[PDB]
Every structure is written in structure tokens, then in C-alpha cells.
Structure 1
Amino acid sequence: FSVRILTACFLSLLILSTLLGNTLVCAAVIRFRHLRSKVTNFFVISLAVSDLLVAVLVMPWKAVAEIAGFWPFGSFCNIWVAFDIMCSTASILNLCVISVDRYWAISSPFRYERKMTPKAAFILISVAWTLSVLISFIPVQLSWHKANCDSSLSRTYAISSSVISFYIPVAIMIVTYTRIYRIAQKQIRRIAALERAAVHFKRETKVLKTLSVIMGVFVCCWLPFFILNCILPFCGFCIDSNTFDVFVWFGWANSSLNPIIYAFNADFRKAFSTLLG
């Protein structure tokens, strides 16, 4: 049908964009050792890998089930929903780390350059991935998540795993970015003092633009899905499978946007330019 072929092409384009952006980040890291040198790059690689897992593992099967209308892989999908929870939690979590990372590298630059040694970087990456695998697979294979294949998470599990995977990271990320805003606003006022002395809100707009882009893409992309994951199993005012499905796709769409907002440093740009040519 007209709508069906359109969903097919849009979903295929979304997957291809996710795969391309994230594989580009991973390649720009593996090829260039001056990108692997820092630690913030360690965290960005972790994020890119999580989103690439989202793509290749989780997204296409749901897209096929969306096109065909029936879930054909069958007993797989037990695994799939587990896979889903993992990849979609290694993404949000990773943002959290990167956010705290930037904060720790701006609120205490000396302590940061001293204490954040690649061992601490690996420990943070380990916490993210191991928290993901734990909180995802274990309640699935033990069938605590259950109250076409029903991916409908149990009423108690929805709120619990939701609180962790989203609401602990959104609280931490909002705290961090509002602190970074306080710091950047302070420094801008200070720099403005000197230039006004010499002469005797553009830089503010730049701060607003970058913080708003980051937090607003993350929230406007992920937040609806998680307030739904909250409200739906309790009440399932209520919504249908198609609407719940588009808000799911918003969740996996953020995994597509992550490269452009978190991997466009100038050196990343130039590495992409020398890669694609």
C-alpha cells in the first residue's frame, strides 16, 4: 500500500543513517590514534558502539514486524526484547557518563587531568555496559518483565527499569548541564568585563544553542516513550499499538542523532572528511 511502502522506505533510511553515523564514529576512532589518545573519546566510542548495537541488533527486526504486520522470527523475540532493553539502555546511560565527564572536565580541570586515568575511564564504561546487560537480560530470561509477540513489560518492571534507565540519567544530565551553564555564564560575564574595559548576548546565545540542542534533542526524542512506559502498563487516556510504536521509534531515533551532536569536534569532522573524501 501507499502508507506501507512509505513506512518501509523511511524506516530503512533511519536504520541506514544510524548505522552510517555510528560506524563513521567508530571508524574515525579506530583509524586515528590522536582520537584514541584522550579519555572523553573513550566515552564517545562507547556511546557510538551502543547506538550501533541498537541499530544492527534491535531496530531492523521491529521494522520488519512493522512492515509485514506479523512477528515471524518467533521464539527469537524473547531474546529481542531483552536485547532491546540492553542496547537502548547502553545509549541513555552513556550519554549520562559523557555528560558527567564533560562536567568533571570543566568544574575541576586540574583534578580531572590528574585523576581520570584510562583505568577510571574503563571502569565507567564497564559500569554502563554491565548495568545494561544486568538490568536487561536477567529479568527477561527469568520472565519477570511479563505481567505478534508481546513485548509489553510488566507493570512493576516498567516503572522500575524505567526509573533506572531514563530517570536516573535525565536527573544526572539535567544537573550536570545546568551546572555547566552556570560556569559558562560566569566566564562569559568575566570575558565581557575585559572587552568593555578595553572599548571604554552572542556568546550567551551560543551557550544556549549548544545546551538546548543537546538536552532538547535527548528529551524531545526519548521522554515521551518513557512517560508512556510509565503510564501504559498501569492503565492498559490510553493509547494504541501504533502510537506506542511511533514513540518507540523516537527512542531509537535519538540513537541516530547521537553522532552529529556528540561526535562533531573539529578533528572528528576532519577525520570524516578524510575518510569519505
Structure 2
Amino acid sequence: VWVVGMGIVMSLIVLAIVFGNVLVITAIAKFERLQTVTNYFITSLACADLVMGLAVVPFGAAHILTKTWTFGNFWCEFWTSIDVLCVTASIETLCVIAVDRYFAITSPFKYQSLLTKNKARVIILMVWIVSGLTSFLPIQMHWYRATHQEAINCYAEETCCDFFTNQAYAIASSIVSFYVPLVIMVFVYSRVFQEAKRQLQKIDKSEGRHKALKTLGIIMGTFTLCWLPFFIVNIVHVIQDNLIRKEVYILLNWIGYVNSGFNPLIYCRSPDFRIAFQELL
């Protein structure tokens, strides 16, 4: 008396993610004046989120509900590679957007010279290629597999595939994918908030006779609350295997996926985006 329910939730999540990604992508594509250096970074993130919602979630849902994987093992390896690719690409695109905002605010006169139409494509391609090399190379080449009897049983067993990794690979992947972007974003947003506070203190001297805090808080808190616990459990569970089981791991992992759906809503809030959406519907 619970199988008929959770499928509804999974379908709702899939539909929400797909619709949110497609609307933003088509709004940027089909309108004349929405092209901007900043919007391309949003386009890359939307493309990554669309791939995640289209490929990763539906098969994982079938695996969880059925409890049996009715395909091959090479397909499981490919699915894992695609999952890692999409996650790391999304995180790195977020950090790139943050750095672009820092460059725009800190140095207004020289903002044009640093970033142009030509130099955004190279950055996007580098982000995507470093995301791809992090996932496909260690996975598709059989170079992450564990050496325990329980893990080798899973690898040899064709029906069921579960994620087991050596501690070194887990630490390196987590460090490359999560910690450095978090540090960068923290530093960027601290500096930006300081600059905003300085300007708000400067205006009151002449204009005699909060909002930025709320905006920065929401922007940072969404990402932190969505993705932080998973990358803590990932590091901790490998050093000592007694503490954590598979169910908690899966629950913490599935929380991160929902973040991809929320992100177009938080980033696409400009009045121009609102007018573009209004023109469609």
C-alpha cells in the first residue's frame, strides 16, 4: 500500500525538472535580445540539468521501486558516469557564475576587457571537459573498483549494481567536485556583501533628512543545505564502514538531485525573463 504513491512523487519531480529546464533554454534561444555574456553560463547549467532530469532520475527511480535492475552492467557503468558528469558540471558552472559576478562588481571599468564573447566559450568548454575527464576516465576504465569480497560479489553479479569505491578515489572526487567551488563561492560572496555594505554606508552621508543580506542568504543557503550533507557522508563512510548504511546514503543523495530543479527558478527572476515567459504562454 505504498508502491502506487512514491511513483507519483518521482514523476512529479521528473516533470518539474524537465519543464523548468526546457522553458529557460527555449526562452534564451528564441528571443532576440536575451543574449548576454552572463546568460551563456546559465545556458550551460540548464543544459546540464536537462540531461540530469532526462537520463539519471528515471532509471534510478525504476531501480529503487523494482529493487531489480533489468538491464546490463555496462549500462550501469554508463549511468554512473553520466550522473557524476552532470553533478560536477552543475557545481562548477555555479562557481563560474559566482566568479563572473565578483569580476563584474569588484572591477567595473575593466569588466569588459576581461570577459568578452570569445572568452566565455573557452571557459565553458574547459569546465565541461574537466567535468568529463573527472567522471568517465576513472569509471569507464575499470579503475575505481574495490577489492573487498562483498564488493567483488557485486561486480561479478550481473543483476545488481551498487556503488563501492576505494577511499582515495572518493576523497579526490569529492575534493575536486565540491570543496573548492564552495570555498570560492564563500570568498566571493563575502567580498560582494562587504562592498554592498560599504556603498550603503556611503549613501547615507549625503542622502540625509538588508535586501542584499536576504538575497545572498537565500542564494548560498539553497546550495549549501541541498548538497552539503551528501559530501560529508561520502567522505566519512569510507574511513569507518560501521557508521553508515545504504539507505541513509541514498536519502542524502536524492536530496541533491532536487536542487537542480530549484535552480532555474532562483536564477531566472529578472523582469526580462518574466516578459519572455509571458510572451510564450
Pick the TM interval, shorter chain.
Answer: over 0.9
- Matching residue of 2:40: 42
Query: Where is the helix percentage greater, Structure 1 or Structure 2?
Result: 1
Q: How does 1:41-120 map to 2 (within 5 A)?
A: 41-75=39-73, 76-120=75-119
Structure-2 separation of matches of 1:63 and 1:154: 26
- Matching residue of 2:204: 192
Partner SS for 1:250: helix
Structure-2 separation of matches of 1:170 and 1:191: 32
Q: Gapped runs of 5+ residues in structure 1?
A: 200-204
- Of 117-126 and 92-101, deviating more is 117-126
> Deviation per CA, 1:164-199, whole angstroms, max 9, x where unpaired?
10011111111111111111111111223222x2x1
Structure-2 separation of matches of 1:151 and 1:59: 16
- Of 228-237 and 102-111, deviating more is 228-237
Q: What value does the CA root-mean-square deviation take over the aligned residues?
A: 1.3
Pairing 1:133–2:145 present: no
Q: Gapped runs of 5+ residues in structure 2?
A: 147-159
Structure-1 separation of matches of 2:278 and 2:57: 28
- Matching residue of 2:151: none
Out of 222, 228, 231, which is 1:223 matched to? 228
- The answer to whether the Cα contact below 8 Å between 1:144 and 1:157 also exists between their aligned partners in 2 is no
Structure-2 separation of matches of 1:256 and 1:266: 20
Cα drift, residue 108 of structure 1: 0.9
- Matching residue of 2:182: 170
Structure-1 separation of matches of 2:122 and 2:10: 35
- Matching residue of 1:270: 275
> Deviation per CA, 1:187-231, whole angstroms, max 9, x where unpaired?
111223222x2x1xxxxx211111111110000000111111111
Give the percent of matched residue pairs that are identical in Structure 1 and Structure 2. 41
- The answer to whether the Cα contact below 8 Å between 1:155 and 1:234 also exists between their aligned partners in 2 is yes
